[PDB]
A paper describes a structure:
The 5′-end capping of nascent pre-mRNA represents the initial step in RNA processing, with evidence demonstrating that guanosine addition and 2′-O-ribose methylation occur in tandem with early steps of transcription by RNA polymerase II, especially at the pausing stage.
However, in our PEC-RNGTT structure, the association of RNGTT disrupts the original binding interface between KOWx-KOW4 and Pol II. The typical position of KOWx-KOW4 in PEC is occupied by the TPase domain and part of the OB fold, leading to diminished visibility of KOWx-KOW4 density. In our cryo-EM structure, RNA protrudes from the RNA exit channel and reaches the TPase of RNGTT. Docking with the crystal structure of mouse RNA triphosphatase into TPase density, we observed that the 5′ -triphosphate points toward the P loop of TPase. Cryo-EM 3D classification of PEC-RNGTT showed two different conformations of the NELF complex in the RNGTT-containing particles. The C-terminal region of NELF-D detaches from RPB1 funnel and trigger loop, leaving the funnel partially open and convenient for NTP delivery to the active site, and trigger loop swings away from funnel helices, recovering its mobility under this conformation.
Residue numbers in the entry:
A (entry chain A): 626 to 673
B (entry chain V): 6 to 555
C (entry chain E): 2 to 210
D (entry chain A): 914 to 1154
E (entry chain A): 1299 to 1394
F (entry chain W): 57 to 588
The structure:
């Protein structure tokens, strides 16, 4: 129950809405800020 | 090699002699060492140490001495008074032979410090030795001083001279400031001076020493005519008050009066309630205790008290003008004048030993004061006329004539002169140049040259700093300097110093022609004092700097 | 009550001292914060027809520099002040040469006297304060940030640096209680330092209108 | 004491420096006293920043919004540059201090050189510079982060770049943006179905009936209140309360 | 007793640290002192602020016009900010 | 006063030669008066002060050691002692051996090996073998350590259960300083415990030493199993060694043990009687949490029952008659108790209901010990006292039952009671806390009723004198004790109960008793007993 994504690879943890949802500091928010914005579009599409 | 003491002298011998008897030396240490069997077994460890056997014993001795000092303090603090005093007396009897030993001298000095009465023989022995006397605490020195008035006077006189010098130097400060003048410090701040604190510590709770100091102050006030001795009397009494010294404050008849006057000085004004309290103190002097009146007059002779009372008198005169009332009908004004009269007559009362209130002259109240009110009245009407619309502006010239009776009052009556001088200071502080020019010719000749006193000149130069822009006018500078300052500067060095200070402060605003004329007129002569020459040199340096700024 | 009256007078005195100090005047340090017992000792502990009555504690203070201008504060005896009462204070001021002054009214001023106060503004300035305004120094409140009056040179520097006019600054009322506390006139930029949770410190400016 | 233990970078200890730094840097720090003076000065600045923060935040919370996520950037530098933080680091703490100062010089909200603009720049990036000093200090970089020199240079570049990207763009329609940012949560808010938990609580009118009273300045609010805080002993006594 | 323009006043001990008195101990650590606070039903500042044993610094209000009459415009800006943040973040939502 | 340096001045006096300027100056270096004598006269001056008591000589020697500690010359200590001389150390150890050499060898202890040797030999020369040992590390040289161990064992064995708490740390800091010394001591314990004529106390002391070893950080369970006969059957002892090296219960390990038990060839029962093993059993079984997975649970219960049930007859190192006819009842009782501790039905809706069955169970000693540990781990949870029936006396009623049905658990019961009494309970009303203390004192009175009195009264006196508790609590204790006891009075009870009653609040004991007389009766009986 402890989500750790490390060096672009999911080490451990189960991703609930607190990991992929609209909460601040989530995986998608950091993917938007650290990576680009086209990359986040690809991220959403691949997940779905 | 005193009582039961081995070699101090043969110790010097032991350091000089140097041949051979080892067993004699060892036996001497055994007999005159730390005579404890328990230490004999512990010494070989010190021998097994390597460091020479001096630092260890010195450290132990110092620790024992400090513990003994702590215990002497504890004995002085704890227990019944008789038992602790007896223990301290026994300890002093056992230890006084070592008073000349530097390592044990602090213990003896502490024991003497905590004793209410040191035996007279030991006190005489201490007095005969300059170093022992110097090392003694003030508590022992009080027991010495109370029965030796000459020695106490020798100790106190430098402080009194220093106090007088400090006051005079404060009167001649380089900075001319209305906000920061001689009367700016609060009484509590003034009592923090080094001389006052040192005198308070020396007197302590001893009434006899306090009376000796009061006698010294009276004698010096009579001999030198310096009012700062009165200032010092007031400050010393109130400094003892601030330390809750009831042994002195309860027996001094001037304590409550001086306290109320100190409050008045702090507020720089005397209200009706405080005036009535001071009057109740004065009227409470019983028949047979009339010398208290001389003491109270000495308190009122304090320049701070005089300044407060005179400023209150001027303010009351202005209020009476506002209220359409005569000076004779105001009891508070009459009371202020009575206090001022006592303060001014202090010297005569003490010198003649005739302790009676000076009679206030009728013509003061009935003539001189309402004429001052007329001067205020002229000022008000001129100010109101200047604000009229231009269509109603008659050519109103300010009244420039000084009545001859006013000048006669300033010349012949001390109280009228004092009140007029403070009125001049008041109008100068208000930047009323017309009234100042009107009254200035009457200050050339005043009662006892009071207009040339250092207090008045200090305040006057400070207030004249507010009229700096008027020094660009040659008529104003001619009036001020030529008609007032230069009339007395050749005969009075202090007037020369005050004029030089004013010129140093205001040279950038003085007209250049008048500036050159004043520089020539204020040139020190061969008989001029060192301070005048120093001030003139400072003025020259400032003038050179100003020329370089062109 | 009599103890309540001396407490109220002491609080008004303390607030007036703090107001004068924050305005930039000569306020003695012990006078700036004195004990209530010290006030009672200095004045009399009986405002009810007694020693610490009004007009006894009219505080006269000068400026820290240029010590000429003074605003010696006024405390009327009556609750409801009028023109014939403020003309006595005008007489006392015209007796002097100083133009600023503060009166501390107990109840509301008569509106005719309110107009009269404006009727001498170019000649000599008079401000008025109710008792409830001076029972709390509002600048000590946590909601009130640090207001500092700016000099004209600093106003010129501000307008030249930001290349904007006095018409464009966010403004402040002349009847603003803080503006009344500092007694600022119209057209006098006030810098305001307040802590911000997003930048640490924020300095805004309020031209007076 | 926790602040001093965590941020001071005690230099007098030998073995701690041996573990945290390489021996050449260890002897460089231990030999020179000018570097020790600079480290003491940066700890002085951090004590000053602590006092400034405690003035700014009287309530004991530190969850504050700032542009550059510095801890995440330090972690990213560690993951990119393959730190292996068991080994002693090889970045000079004086390099850390000077780089932080140069970076604080490089982060510009307000241009100009006159002291008014200098004060504006200081106030605009006061909180962020406090956070930058706190996160990128010498002690933490030597003990709990252990970045390398090239990693530190990349970190400074990344911080500068990501701060320069967060500047408000001239021409942004801020007013409509804020109006929508406030009116969009308005729909998600209740009208008036507050639980009215009767624990005193005065039935504070909350939701839209309160947002409206704030939006149009109502001189007749549904529920006007005070919050009267007691001063001294009366605050800790129910009877005086 | 009391002032006009006010109905029954309710007093309580706070739970959230926004109302709890946050002090700084001599070792620098924050501490939340839970002291009694009052909470009225009317509104009158500059008269409650004048009362004895009332903290004249932290005593805020709920009405804005009353503060504008009492504490000015910038204090009203701060009070409007705090009240707006209160009404927004009551239900756990966040607005920048 | 340069006389005090006759010796070194000597060889520089007869043989000075050359330029004796430094010789004359060092002959002249004592520029003060006879301050050696003046330092002794400081005691005479203190005679007029407060006190230059023998403590004055003690303080002089303390300053001696204070300035000695600078040099404390290890430097030439070996040389000066290899000189084969020096009654200095001998005389100091004869007279001042209290703490001087103690601090000396506590300071550095690496150098001065011969000063240390002389001090240690003089410590050996002292009667009570090891009390001035300048170090608790006196376990290095065997001839000293064996005799010190012998005398300490004699002291403890002559002491008893009361001295078991006072002397055991002072005995275990030596035998646990070194684990080779621990092995030596445990081997001696084993050899002395070979005898059944009083070796039980030796085994108890060995077990306490092993418990202290476990506390301090030893993995001493392997040594304990090596000393025992359990190693004769290898695999079970190896399993125990691993399990006790980990200090936790493994179901696989217990299945390995259980496969070897309950067969026709059981191991000697002394392999399972080790108390740390049973303590780990209690930890893993009767914690309020720590659920056991219902499958090897009966194996746990059977192992505990076999540990605490069976008897044997070692007729010349062989058993011929054992029985297992009561471990079924023991297993049933322990199973019921574990079920009661596992159901944890909220506020004992069931704990109160099955209390009669619990009373039936606690007739057994292992059951009583397990319930005591479970109540210790339940009541001592912070913020527990929020259920209140009569300030929650239910678990304290179980405490009373445990104290009633047995006597060897009384030290643990009193330890739990005083641990709860010393524990300040936050978030409770002050009157509520006071009544909780009253309930605990009622439990202590019940302990006092069943014979276990002297430690309880000793703790009451300790908490009245040292870190003094409320006087009203001691008054209530006296009131409740004297409402139930009266006539005969063994002398020890009177000797311990007199000072707390006669000093410090005589008056509060008697208010409204009347029908049965107050402490006056106890005072009269105390007068009649002793010799005034």
């Amino acid at each position: 129950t402890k989500v750790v994504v490390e060096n672009g690879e999911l080490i451990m943890g189960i991703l609930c809405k607190k990991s992929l949802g609209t909460s601040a500091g989530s995986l998608v928010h950091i993917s938007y800020l650290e990576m680009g914005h086209d990359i986040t579009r690809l991220f959403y599409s691949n997940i779905q | 090699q005193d009582l039961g003491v081995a070699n101090g002298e043969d110790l010097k011998e032991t350091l000089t002699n140097c041949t051979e008897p080892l067993k004699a030396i060892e036996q001497f240490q055994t007999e005159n060492g730390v005579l404890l069997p328990s230490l004999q077994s512990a010494l070989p460890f010190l021998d097994l140490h390597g460091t020479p056997r001096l630092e260890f014993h010195q450290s132990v001795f110092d620790e024992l001495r400090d513990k003994l000092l702590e215990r002497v303090s504890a004995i002085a603090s704890e227990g019944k008074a008789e038992e602790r005093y007896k223990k301290l007396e026994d300890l002093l009897e056992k230890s006084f032979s070592l008073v000349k030993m530097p390592s044990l001298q602090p213990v003896v000095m502490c024991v003497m410090k905590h004793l209410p009465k040191v035996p007279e023989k030991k006190l005489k022995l201490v007095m005969a030795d300059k170093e022992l006397y110097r090392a003694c605490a003030v508590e022992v020195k009080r027991q010495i001083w109370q029965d030796n008035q000459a020695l106490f006077g020798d100790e106190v006189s430098p402080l009194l001279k220093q106090y007088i010098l400090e006051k005079e130097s404060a009167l001649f400060s380089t900075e001319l400031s209305v906000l920061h003048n001689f009367f700016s410090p609060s009484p509590k701040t003034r009592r923090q001076g080094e001389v006052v604190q040192r005198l308070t510590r020396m007197v302590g709770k001893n009434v006899k020493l306090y009376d000796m100091v009061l006698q010294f102050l009276r004698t010096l006030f009579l001999r030198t005519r310096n009012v700062h001795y009165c200032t010092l009397r007031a400050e010393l009494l109130m400094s003892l008050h601030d330390l809750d010294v009831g042994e002195i404050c309860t027996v001094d008849p001037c304590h409550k009066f001086t306290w109320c006057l100190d409050a008045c000085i702090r507020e720089r004004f005397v209200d009706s309630k405080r005036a009535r309290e001071l009057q109740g103190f004065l009227d409470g002097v019983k028949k047979g205790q009339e010398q208290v009146l001389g003491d109270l007059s000495m308190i009122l002779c304090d320049p701070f008290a005089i300044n407060t009372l005179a400023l209150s008198t001027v303010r009351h005169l202005q209020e009476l003008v506002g209220q359409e009332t005569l000076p004779r009908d105001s009891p508070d004004l009459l009371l202020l004048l009575r206090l001022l009269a006592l303060g001014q007559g202090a010297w005569d009362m003490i010198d003649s030993q005739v302790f009676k209130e000076p009679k206030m002259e009728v013509e003061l109240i009935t003539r001189f004061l309402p004429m001052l009110m007329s001067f205020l009245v002229d000022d008000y009407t001129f100010n109101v006329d200047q604000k009229l619309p231009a269509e109603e502006k008659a050519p109103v010239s300010y009244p420039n004539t000084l009545p001859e009776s006013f000048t006669k009052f300033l010349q012949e009556q001390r109280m009228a002169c004092e009140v007029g001088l403070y009125y001049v200071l008041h109008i100068t502080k208000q930047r009323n140049k017309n009234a100042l020019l009107r009254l200035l010719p009457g200050l050339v000749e005043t009662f006892g040259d009071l207009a040339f006193g250092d207090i008045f000149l200090h305040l006057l130069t400070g207030n004249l700093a507010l009229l700096a822009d008027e020094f660009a006018l040659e008529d104003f500078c001619s009036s001020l300097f030529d008609g007032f300052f230069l009339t007395a500067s050749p005969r009075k060095e202090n007037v020369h110093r005050h004029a030089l200070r004013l010129l140093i402060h205001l040279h950038p605003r003085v007209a250049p022609s008048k500036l050159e004329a004043l520089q020539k007129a204020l040139e020190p002569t061969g008989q001029s004092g060192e301070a005048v020459k120093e001030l003139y040199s400072q003025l020259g340096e400032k003038l050179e700097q100003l020329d370089h700024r062109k | 009550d009599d103890e309540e009256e001396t407490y109220r007078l002491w609080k008004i005195r303390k607030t007036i001292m703090q107001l004068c100090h924050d305005r930039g005047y000569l306020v003695t340090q012990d006078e700036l914060d004195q004990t209530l017992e010290e006030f009672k000792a200095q004045f009399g502990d009986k405002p009810s027809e007694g020693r610490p009555r009004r007009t006894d504690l009219t505080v006269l203070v000068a400026h820290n520099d240029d010590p000429t201008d003074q605003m010696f504060v006024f405390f009327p005896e009556e609750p409801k002040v009028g023109i014939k009462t403020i003309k006595v204070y005008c007489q006392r001021m015209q007796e002097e040469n100083i133009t600023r002054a503060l009166i501390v009214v107990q109840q509301g001023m008569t509106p005719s006297a309110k107009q009269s106060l404006v009727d001498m503004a170019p000649k000599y300035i008079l401000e008025q304060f109710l008792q409830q305004e001076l029972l709390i120094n509002i600048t000590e409140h946590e909601l009130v940030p640090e207001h500092v009056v700016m000099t004209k040179e600093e106003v010129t520097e501000l307008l030249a640096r930001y290349k904007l006019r006095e018409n464009q600054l966010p403004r402040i009322q002349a009847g603003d209680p803080v503006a009344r506390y500092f007694g600022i006139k119209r057209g006098q930029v006030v810098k305001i330092i307040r802590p911000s949770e997003t930048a640490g410190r924020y300095i805004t400016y309020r031209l007076v209108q | 004491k926790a602040f001093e233990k965590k941020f001071r970078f005690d230099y007098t200890n030998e073995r701690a420096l041996r573990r945290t730094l390489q021996e050449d840097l260890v002897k460089d720090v231990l030999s020179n006293a000018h570097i020790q003076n600079e480290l003491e000065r940066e700890f002085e600045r951090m004590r000053e920043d602590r006092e400034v923060l405690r003035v700014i935040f009287p309530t004991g919370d530190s969850k504050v919004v700032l542009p550059c996520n510095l801890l995440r950037m330090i972690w990213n530098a560690q993951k990119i540059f393959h730190i292996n933080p068991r080994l002693p680091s090889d970045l000079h703490p004086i390099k850390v201090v000077e780089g932080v100062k140069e970076l604080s010089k490089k982060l510009v909200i307000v241009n100009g050189d006159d002291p008014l603009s200098r004060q504006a720049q200081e106030n605009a990036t006061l909180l962020f510079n406090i956070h930058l000093r706190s996160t990128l200090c010498s002690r933490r970089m030597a003990e709990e982060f252990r970045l390398s020199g090239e990693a530190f240079d990349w970190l400074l570049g990344e911080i500068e770049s990501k701060f320069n990207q967060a500047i408000a763009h001239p021409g942004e329609m801020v007013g409509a943006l804020a109006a929508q940012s406030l009116g969009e949560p308005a729909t998600q808010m209740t009208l008036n179905t507050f639980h009215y938990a009767g624990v005193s609580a005065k039935n504070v009118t909350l939701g839209v009936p309160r947002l409206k009273e704030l939006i149009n300045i109502s001189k007749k609010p549904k529920t006007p209140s005070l919050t009267v805080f007691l001063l001294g002993q009366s605050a800790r006594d129910a009877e005086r309360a | 007793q009391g002032i006009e323009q006010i109905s029954k006043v309710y007093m309580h001990l706070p739970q959230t640290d926004n109302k709890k008195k946050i002090i700084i101990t001599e070792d620098g650590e924050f501490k939340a002192l839970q002291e009694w606070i009052l909470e009225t039903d009317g509104v009158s500042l500059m008269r409650v602020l004048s009362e004895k044993d009332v903290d004249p610094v932290r005593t805020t209000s709920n009405d804005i016009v009353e503060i504008f009459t009492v504490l000015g415009i910038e204090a009203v800006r701060k009070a409007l900010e705090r009240e707006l943040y209160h009404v927004i973040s009551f239900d756990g939502s966040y607005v920048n | 006063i340069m006389e005090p340096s006759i010796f070194n001045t000597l060889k520089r006096y007869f043989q000075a030669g050359g330029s004796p300027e430094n010789v004359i100056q060092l002959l002249s270096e004592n520029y003060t008066a006879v301050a050696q004598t003046v330092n002794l006269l400081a005691e005479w001056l203190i005679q007029t002060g407060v006190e230059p008591v023998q403590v004055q000589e003690t303080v002089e020697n303390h300053l001696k050691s204070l300035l000695i500690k600078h040099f404390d010359p290890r430097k030439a200590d070996s040389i000066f002692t290899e000189e084969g001389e020096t009654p200095a150390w001998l005389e100091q150890m004869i007279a001042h051996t209290t703490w001087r050499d103690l601090f000396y060898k506590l300071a550095e202890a690496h150098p001065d090996c011969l000063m240390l040797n002389f001090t240690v030999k003089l410590i050996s020369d002292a009667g009570y073998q090891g009390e001035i040992t300048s170090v608790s590390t006196a376990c290095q040289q065997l001839e000293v350590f064996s005799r010190v161990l012998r005398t300490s064992l004699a002291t403890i064995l002559d002491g008893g259960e009361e001295n078991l708490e006072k002397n055991l740390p002072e005995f275990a800091k030596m035998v646990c300083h070194g684990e080779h010394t621990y092995l030596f001591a445990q081997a001696m314990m084993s050899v002395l415990a070979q005898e059944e004529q009083g070796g039980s106390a030796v085994r108890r002391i060995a077990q306490e030493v092993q418990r202290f070893a476990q506390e301090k950080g030893h993995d001493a369970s392997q040594i304990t199993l090596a000393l025992g006969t359990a190693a004769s059957y290898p695999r079970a002892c190896q399993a125990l060694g691993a399990m006790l090296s980990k200090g936790a219960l493994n179901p696989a390990d217990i299945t390995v043990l259980f496969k070897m038990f309950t067969s026709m060839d059981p191991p000697p029962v002394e392999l399972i009687r080790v108390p740390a093993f049973l303590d780990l059993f209690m930890q893993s079984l009767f914690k309020p949490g720590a659920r056991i997975n219902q499958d090897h649970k009966h194996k746990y219960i059977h192992i505990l029952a076999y540990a605490a049930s069976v008897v044997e007859t070692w007729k010349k190192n062989k058993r011929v008659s054992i029985n297992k006819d009561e471990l079924k009842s023991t297993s049933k009782a322990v199973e019921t108790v574990h079920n009661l501790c596992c159901n944890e039905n909220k506020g004992a809706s069931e704990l109160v209901a099955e209390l009669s069955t619990l009373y039936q169970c606690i007739r057994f000693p292992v059951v009583a010990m397990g319930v005591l540990k479970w109540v210790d781990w339940t009541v001592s949870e912070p913020r527990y006292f929020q259920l209140q029936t009569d300030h929650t006396p239910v678990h304290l009623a179980l405490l009373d039952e445990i104290s009633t049905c047995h006597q060897l658990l009384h030290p643990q019961v009193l330890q739990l009671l005083v641990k709860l009494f010393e524990t300040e309970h936050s978030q409770l009303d002050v009157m509520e806390q006071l009544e909780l203390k009253k309930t605990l004192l009622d439990r202590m009175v019940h302990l006092l009723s069943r014979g276990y009195v002297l430690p309880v009264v000793s703790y009451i006196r300790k908490c009245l004198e040292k870190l003094d508790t409320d006087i009203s609590l001691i008054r209530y204790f006296v009131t409740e004790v004297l409402d139930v006891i009266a006539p005969p009075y063994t002398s020890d009870f009177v000797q311990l109960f007199l000072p707390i009653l006669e000093n410090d609040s005589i008056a509060g004991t008697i208010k409204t008793e009347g029908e049965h007389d107050p402490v006056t009766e106890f005072i009269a009986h105390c007068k009649s007993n002793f010799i005034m």
